Amino acid sequence: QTCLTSSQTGTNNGFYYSFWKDSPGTVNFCLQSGGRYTSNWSGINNWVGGKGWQTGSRRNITYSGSFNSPGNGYLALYGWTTNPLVEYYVVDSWGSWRPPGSDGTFLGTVNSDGGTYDIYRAQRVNAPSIIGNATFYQYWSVRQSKRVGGTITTGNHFDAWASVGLNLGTHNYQIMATEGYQSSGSSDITVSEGG
């Protein structure tokens, strides 16, 4: 295992990973065998990290494990595109606070992987991104009830987002992410693309 406590991207056991946190608190973000990582967080302001791919695609992404967020956290497929700069989520579970909140514009729903998801678009104006300080839209599929474990058929979400005018650019990274906000919690997630 390789345990990290501050921001880093890289590769581990054939998988890409991205891990980011601002200054407050502690994240113990530990890279295990295969597509597995664990996290715990405490007294943090905001952090997101996980394993996946350097270059996103329409691959079907399967994950399993635990997610424990008594306060504000997410368990989500998470990635970026450029041209347009987009930060996207397919949110399967969350903690105290269902995302994206009042900043989100509701656009409709998509049925995928035995769930229904609400589709939202939000905007970030002068915000930190994979290319630095920028203004970018976020695309959200958020499951109507929580789940921890299953397959995410990315094409279904990508196709549904497209039908509501949410354009995906050139894919950057694509990970099964844990996110915490002003809370404490843990997760233990294994990703793959072979069911």
Alpha-carbon 47 to chain mean position: 11
Question: Any bridge partners for residue 185, and if so which?
Answer: 41
Question: Any bridge partners for residue 12, and if so which?
Answer: 15
1-195 folds as Jelly Rolls (2.60.120)
Are 86 and 169 in contact by the 8 Å Cβ rule? The answer is yes
- Around Cβ 113, how many Cβ atoms within 10 Å? 17
Half-sphere exposure of 20 (CA within 13 A, CB side): 12
Rounded Cα distance between 56 and 194, Å, is 15
Rounded Cα distance between 67 and 19, Å, is 17
Rounded Cα distance between 45 and 175, Å, is 21
For residue 50, what are its two tokens?
């996980």
Q: Which residues are designated catalytic?
A: 87, 179
Rounded Cα distance between 22 and 122, Å, is 21
β-strand pairing of 115-129 with 15-21: unpaired
| Technique of determination | X-ray
Domain spans of the chain? 1-195
